[PDB]
Nucleic acid binder design. Structure first.
Length: 66
RNA sequence: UGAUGGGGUUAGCGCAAGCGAAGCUCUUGAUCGAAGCCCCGGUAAACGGCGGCCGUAACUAUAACGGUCCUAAGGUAGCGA
């Protein structure tokens, strides 16, 4: 994790300061990725749908017995 | 090409003055007038040229997509330090 990059030649060294600076700073941002898409914010609308989806199959299992 | 009108000079009409035929001049030029030009299309293995801005998907990251502007058209196939 010695994370290296060669901020090569320029007409002002400080230019690559702000270059390598915004590079590492943003790198930390890009590597924020809190589980790549995970908040996860799992809605409740899809939960009732599948729940009622389990309901339809429930009553049909009133099939064969006795 | 040359219709006209306009200027100069001077028989005759007239004793100043003036007028002015006619001649000849100077000038104006109506009119005639083709291609080109304009309009019109076709033409890119003719010369050539072949975009912006901005938002958006289960926080993250990108944006298939969406909005709007602009252009004659908005770079496909393939390829790419």
């Amino acid at each position: 994790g010695v994370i290296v990059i060669k901020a090569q030649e320029y007409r002002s060294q400080e230019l690559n300061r702000e270059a390598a600076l915004a590079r590492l700073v943003a790198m930390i941002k890009e590597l924020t990725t809190e589980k790549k898409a995970r908040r996860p914010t799992r809605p409740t609308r899809a939960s009732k749908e599948r729940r009622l989806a389990s309901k339809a199959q429930k009553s049909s299992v009133k099939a064969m017995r006795g």
